[PDB]
Amino acid sequence: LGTENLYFLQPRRVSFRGEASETLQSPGYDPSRPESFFQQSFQRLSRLGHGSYGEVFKVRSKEDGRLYAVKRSMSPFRGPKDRARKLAEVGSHEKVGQHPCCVRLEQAWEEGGILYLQTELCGPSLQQHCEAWGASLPEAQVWGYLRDTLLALAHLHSQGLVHLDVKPANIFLGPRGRCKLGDFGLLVELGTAGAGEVQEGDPRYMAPELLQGSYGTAADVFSLGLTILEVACNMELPHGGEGWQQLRQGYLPPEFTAGLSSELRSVLVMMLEPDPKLRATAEALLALPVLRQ
Numbered sequence: 001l002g003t004e005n006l007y008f009l010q011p012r013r014v015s016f017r018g019e020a021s022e023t024l025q026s027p028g029y030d031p032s033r034p035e036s037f038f039q040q041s042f043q044r045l046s047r048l049g050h051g052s053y054g055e056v057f058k059v060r061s062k063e064d065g066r067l068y069a070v071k072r073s074m075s076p077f078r079g080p081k082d083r084a085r086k087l088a089e090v091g092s093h094e095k096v097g098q099h100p101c102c103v104r105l106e107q108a109w110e111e112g113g114i115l116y117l118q119t120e121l122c123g124p125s126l127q128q129h130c131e132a133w134g135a136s137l138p139e140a141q142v143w144g145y146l147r148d149t150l151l152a153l154a155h156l157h158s159q160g161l162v163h164l165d166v167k168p169a170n171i172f173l174g175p176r177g178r179c180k181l182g183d184f185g186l187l188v189e190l191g192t193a194g195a196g197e198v199q200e201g202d203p204r205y206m207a208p209e210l211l212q213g214s215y216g217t218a219a220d221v222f223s224l225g226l227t228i229l230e231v232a233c234n235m236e237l238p239h240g241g242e243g244w245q246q247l248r249q250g251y252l253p254p255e256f257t258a259g260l261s262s263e264l265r266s267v268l269v270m271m272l273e274p275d276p277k278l279r280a281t282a283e284a285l286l287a288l289p290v291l292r293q
């Protein structure tokens with residue numbers, strides 16, 4: 001909080017469910033050496049992605065020799081609110097817990113005002129995959145991605161959690177056609193911190209009701225609806241303007257969606273229902289014969 005007297009450091013494990021072992025240890029790591037825990041405890045193999053948040057690296061852990069993704073924040077915390085905001089991702093990630101369609105958090109720690117998030121290394125995001133594909137993804141695969149991500153959303157929504165930033169860039173491929181939802185930085189728990197507390201996801205995938213500060217689990221279904229549209233049709237979604245409004249008026253452009261099967265188009269229509277009270281739930285979608293087993 002910005003009105004409290006906590007205004008104005010070596011590694012410390014971040015957890016909202018752990019033990020007195022806030023101290024980290026690892027092969028390769030000596031606290032008395034000047035290098036950070038991240039530098040000492042991991043082989044840095046490549047940079048998976050980057051942005052205003054910082055960077056994500058593919059790493060090999062010196063602890064177990066396994067591969068992971070580590071997201072490192074851009075610079076030291078601006079202050080307590082900045083810190084609480086970034087640390088909330090860890091808490092979010094933990095409330096999800098272990099679900100086969102959600103990216104697992106291995107561990108998290110802060111050092112020198114920098115936050116590090118270590119997660120299981122999955123395959124490329126759907127966005128990266130579509131870019132490498134250079135075209136529409138086959139529907140056979142898309143049905144699989146839709147179902148997995150619906151299972152993740154069903155999980156989140158059961159606990160009154162809303163992701164609020166579902167998009168191709170944070171659904172990651174698994175082996176043999178599976179995929180996992182990740183990037184839980186914007187996730188909110190409904191009815192917790194009621195005075196707050198949303199920031200807004202990517203405008204391309206934003207549910208229309210959010211413009212009016214009205215949010216609920218339904219917003220995630222709409223976001224996924226547009227996610228699947230983009231990857232299934234190889235369609236660039238608008239950030240705004242006439243096209244943005246049209247996609248939130250139940251309109252599906254023929255010049256990109258003519259190649260959809262009737263069954264998939266039918267499912268997208270339910271997900272892109274402008275009125276969140278009529279929009280299908282993830283549980284209801286999963287109950288349809290076309291999305292079971």
Ligand SMILES: C=CCn1c(=O)c2cnc(Nc3ccc(N4CCN(C)CC4)cc3)nc2n1-c1cccc(C(C)(C)O)n1
Binds near residue numbers: 069125182
């Ligand atoms: C907390 C970190 C978020 N995050 C994960 O949790 C995570 C897990 N697995 C992966 N895997 C992954 C594997 C390969 C690739 N690429 C292959 C190499 N290309 C040049 C780029 C694409 C790419 C990824 N990637 C993962 N993450 C990741 C990696 C890059 C970018 C982003 C965001 C969502 C922040 O944009 N997230």
